[PDB]
Amino acid sequence: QQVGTSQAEVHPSMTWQSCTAGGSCTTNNGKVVIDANWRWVHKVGDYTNCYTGNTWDTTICPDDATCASNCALEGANYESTYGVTASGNSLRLNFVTTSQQKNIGSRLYMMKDDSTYEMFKLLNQEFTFDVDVSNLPCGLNGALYFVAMDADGGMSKYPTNKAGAKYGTGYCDSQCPRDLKFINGQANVEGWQPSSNDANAGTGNHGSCCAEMDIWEANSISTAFTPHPCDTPGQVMCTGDACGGTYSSDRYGGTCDPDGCDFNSFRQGNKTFYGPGMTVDTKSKFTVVTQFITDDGTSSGTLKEIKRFYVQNGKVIPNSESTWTGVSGNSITTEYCTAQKSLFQDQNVFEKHGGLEGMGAALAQGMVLVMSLWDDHSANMLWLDSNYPTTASSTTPGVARGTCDISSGVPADVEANHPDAYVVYSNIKVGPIGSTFNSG
Ligand SMILES: OC[C@H]1O[C@@H](O[C@H]2[C@H](O)[C@@H](F)[C@H](O)O[C@@H]2CO)[C@H](O)[C@@H](O)[C@@H]1O
Ligand SMILES: *[C@@H]1O[C@H](CO)[C@@H](O)[C@H](O)[C@H]1NC(C)=O
Ligand SMILES: [Zn+2]
Numbered sequence: 509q510q511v512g513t514s515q516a517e518v519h520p521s522m523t524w525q526s527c528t529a530g531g532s533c534t535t536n537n538g539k540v541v542i543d544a545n546w547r548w549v550h551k552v553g554d555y556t557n558c559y560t561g562n563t564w565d566t567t568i569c570p571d572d573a574t575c576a577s578n579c580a581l582e583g584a585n586y587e588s589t590y591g592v593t594a595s596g597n598s599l600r601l602n603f604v605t606t607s608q609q610k611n612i613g614s615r616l617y618m619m620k621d622d623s624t625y626e627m628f629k630l631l632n633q634e635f636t637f638d639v640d641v642s643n644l645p646c647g648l649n650g651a652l653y654f655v656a657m658d659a660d661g662g663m664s665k666y667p668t669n670k671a672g673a674k675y676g677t678g679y680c681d682s683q684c685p686r687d688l689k690f691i692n693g694q695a696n697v698e699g700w701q702p703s704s705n706d707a708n709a710g711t712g713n714h715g716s717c718c719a720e721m722d723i724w725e726a727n728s729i730s731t732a733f734t735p736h737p738c739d740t741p742g743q744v745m746c747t748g749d750a751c752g753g754t755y756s757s758d759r760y761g762g763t764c765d766p767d768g769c770d771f772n773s774f775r776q777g778n779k780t781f782y783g784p785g786m787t788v789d790t791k792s793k794f795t796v797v798t799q800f801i802t803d804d805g806t807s808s809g810t811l812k813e814i815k816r817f818y819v820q821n822g823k824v825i826p827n828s829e830s831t832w833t834g835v836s837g838n839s840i841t842t843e844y845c846t847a848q849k850s851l852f853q854d855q856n857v858f859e860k861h862g863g864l865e866g867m868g869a870a871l872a873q874g875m876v877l878v879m880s881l882w883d884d885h886s887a888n889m890l891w892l893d894s895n896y897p898t899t900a901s902s903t904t905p906g907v908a909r910g911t912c913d914i915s916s917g918v919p920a921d922v923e924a925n926h927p928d929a930y931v932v933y934s935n936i937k938v939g940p941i942g943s944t945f946n947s948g
Contacts, residue, residue: 509544509549509576509579509580509581509668509669509670509671509675509677509690509693509695510552510576510577510578510579510580510581510670510671511580511581511670511671511674511675512548512550512552512580512581512582512583514550514555514582514583515548515582515583515584515585516583517541517582517583517584517674517675518583519539519540519541519619519622519674520539520540520586520592520593520594520599521537521538521539521594522538522539522540522594522596522597522598522599522618523535523536523537523538523596523597524536524538524597524618524936524937524938525597525935525936525937525938526937526938526939527937527938527939527940527943527944528939528940528943529939529940529942529943530943531943531944533937533939533944536626538618538619538620538626539618539619539622540592540594540599540616540617540618540619540879541616541617541619541673541674541675541676542584542586542590542592542614542615542616542676543614543615543616543617543676543679544581544671544675544676544677544679544689544690545615545679545687545688545689546584546590546611546614546615546676547581547582547584547675547676548581548582549579549580549581549582549689550579550580550582551565551568551578551579551580552577552578552579552580556568558575558578558579558695559689561702561707561708562702562703562706562707562708562709562710563700563702563710564695564697564700566697569695569697570697571697571698572694572695572696572697572698572714573668573694573695575694575695575697576668576669576690576693576694576695577668579695580671581671581675581677581690585607588605588607589605589607589609589611590605590611590614591603591604591605591611591614591930592614592616596934597934597935597936598932598933598934598935599616599879599932599933599934600930600931600932601613601614601616601650601879601880601881601930601931601932601933602881602928602929602930603648603881603883603922603923603926603927603928603929603930604923604926604927604928606927612708612883612923613880613881613882613883614880614881615676615679615878615879615880615882616878616879616880617657617673617676617876617877617878618876618877618879619673620659622674623660623663623672623673623674624659624660624673625657625658625659625660625661625673625876626876626877627659627874627875627876628654628874628875628876628877628938629807629871629872629874629875630654630721630800630871630875630938631800631802631807631808631809631811631868631871631872632800632801632802632805632806632807632809632940632941633799633800633807633938633939633940633941634797634798634799634800634938634939634940634941634942634943634944635723635797635798635800635936635937635938636795636796636797636798636935636936636937636938636944636945637652637723637724637795637796637933637934637935637936637937638793638794638795638796638933638934638935639652639724639726639793639794639796639931639932639933639934640792640793640931640932640934641726641727641728641731641790641931642728642790642791642792642793643728643928643929643930643931644726644727644728644929644930644931645727645728645729645922645925645926645929646727646729646889646893646894646910646912646913646916646917647727647883647884647888647889647893647912647916647917647918647919647921647922647926648727648881648882648883648889648922648926648929649725649726649727649880649881649882649883649884649889649892650724650726650727650880650881650931650933651722651724651725651726651878651879651880651881651882652723652724652877652878652879652880652933653720653721653722653723653724653725653877653878653880654720654721654723654871654875654876654877654878655679655680655681655682655718655719655720655875655876655878656680656718656719656720656741656742656743656870656873656874656875656876657678657679657680657718657742657743657875657876658678658742658743659673659874659876660672660673660678661673661674661675661676661677661678662677662678662692662693662743663677665692665693666692666693667693668693668694669690669692669693677690678716678743679716680716680717680718680742680743680744681716681717681718681720681736682717682718682719682720682736682737682738682753682764682765682766682768683753683754683755683764683766684715684716684717684746684751684752684753684756684762684763684764685715685716685753685755686711686712686713686714686715686751686753686755686756687703687709687710687711687712687755688712688714688715688716689712691714691715691716691745692714692716692743692745694714695712696711696712696713696714697712698712698713698714699711699712699713699748700712700713703885705885705919705920706885706919709885711755713747713748714745714746714747715745715746715747715751715753716743716744716745716746717738717740717743717744717745717746717751717753717762717763717764718738718740718741718742718743718744718764718870719736719737719738719741719742719764719866719867719869719870719875720735720736720738720764720768720870721734721735721736721867721870721871721875722734722735722736722768723796723798724796724798725892726892727889727892727893728783728784728790728791729783729784729790729893729910729911729912730772730774730775730782730783730892730893730909730910730912731772731773731782731892732770732771732772732775732892732909733770733771733798733814733816733840734768734769734770734771735768735769735814735840735858735864735867736764736765736766736767736768736858736867737764737765737858737861737862737863737864737865737866737867737869737870738763738764738765738861738862738866738870739763739764739861739862739866740763741866741869741870741872741873742870742873744763746762746763749761750762752764752766753766754766754886754887755886760855760857763861764861765857765858765860765861766857767854767855767857767858768858769840769844769845769848769849769858769863769864771816771827771830771839771840771844772892772909772910773827773828774908774909774910774911775906775908775909776828776829776830776831776832776835776848777830777831777832777905778828778829778831779911781828782828783910783911787825787828788818788820788825789820792820793820793932793934794818794819794820795818795819795820795935795945796816796817796818797815797816797817797818797819797944797945798814798815798816799813799814799815799816799817799941800814800868800871801813801814801815801941802868808872810864810865810868811864811865811867811868811871812841812842812864813839813840813841813864814839814840814864815827815838815839816838816839817945819945819946824945824946824947826838827839830844830848832848832851832905833851834847834850834851835847835848835851835905840864841864842859842863842864845858845859845863845864846859848906851905851906852905852906853906854906877936879933881929881930881931883917883919883922883923884917884919885919887917888916888917888918888919889912889916889917890909890912890914890916890917891909892909892910893909893910893911893912893916893917894908894909894910894911894912894913894914894916894917895907895908895909895914896909898914
């Protein structure tokens with residue numbers, strides 16, 4: 509895609525800290541950028557949309573290449589259009605924002621400079637942040653996660669992408685998403701079909717795969733952390749239902765693990781650990797620590813374990829133990845993942861796509877920090893916060909993931925009932941294991 513000039517692109521500032529062993533930290537002058545899929549796209553030199561609602565203008569966009577040549581991404585009004593505000597070390601995302609149009613959700617990336625994403629290298633480090641999920645109901649997900657995107661959003665690979673990271677190009681994730689309007693400097697008009705339940709979305713013939721470490725997928729009721737490996741760790745364009753992932757005829761048919769190896773304390777058998785008034789009390793801000801432990805204790809070792817700690821009201825809270833017979837421990841390891849998938853009768857493509865070692869291979873490439881707020885047009889967030897599938901019995905291990913009702917989370921309802929839901933991420937810190945909190 510091209511660069512539009514109607515609206516200048518100015519990235520809101522957001523600081524974050526790099527820490528050393530001992531706990532000393534230095535502040536980085538980061539800034540955030542909205543994903544290109546949220547932007548106004550118009551014909552170069554004009555105001556006519558290339559895409560409107562969930563359909564393309566096929567005169568301007570008769571094929572993927574001509575469309576990329578003819579269509580320009582515009583700058584964003586972060587607060588007024590998208591409900592995105594930042595101050596100091598804090599980022600607030602609102603769910604619905606009405607301007608001339610009704611915007612729903614957002615997806616933001618952390619930048620190093622105005623043309624380049626920040627590339628985090630998490631092996632043998634911990635990533636820590638504060639969050640306020642107290643305004644997130646059933647059916648919404650404030651996500652903070654990492655994907656193996658290119659640092660320049662694909663500019664240097666794809667000359668037909670003139671916009672790059674400055675305009676939030678280059679997204680990919682372990683669902684191999686086909687809802688992206690531009691992938692690899694090509695539009696996705698070919699094969700496009702509108703969503704039956706999202707007036708703003710559709711899918712095209714191309715998808716964008718890469719590995720994904722889900723640090724945080726949460727609302728006030730449930731949370732989960734989940735590595736998703738792929739055969740290739742970095743961005744790859746896939747075609748058609750062979751992409752696999754959510755929204756394909758077979759989520760398991762492609763090169764990425766769509767499910768991941770997850771740890772949700774409630775799903776792992778503790779119903780009183782995370783939630784309103786619980787050990788980790790979602791009625792107020794808390795700190796979330798996530799550690800990427802390697803086999804040899806160095807940054808070039810193989811990923812062996814992912815650990816989780818919380819801090820709230822100054823008390824350090826270790827992750828809850830998984831309580832199911834034969835699925836023990838309080839962290840993610842290969843033995844946990846194998847045992848958990850067996851007990852829960854979930855297809856284990858985690859190992860097929862490389863397991864923790866494969867996840868680590870992605871971590872070693874460098875990964876982009878994503879902060880988002882979304883509702884779920886496939887599964888109504890029930891996989892996170894309810895019984896899933898909704899036909900199954902809550903007494904069966906793996907089915908119950910939170911206390912939300914099985915008829916919660918339908919996007920039309922969420923969008924009607926919770927337009928002023930929001931999430932606040934703040935106080936990001938990265939450094940050696942134990943360096944960001946009162947360890948160990
Ligand atoms: O596609 C929705 C999310 O799925 C999450 O994986 C689920 C499955 O969908 C279930 F079938 C399975 O029993 O449990 C796993 C874990 O909750 C996936 O982790 C997430 O990335 C997807 O958005
Ligand atoms: C839930 O986790 C908390 C904190 O670790 C613990 O105090 C409580 O006993 C746990 N419940 C179960 C059923 O293990
Ligand atoms: Zn015109």
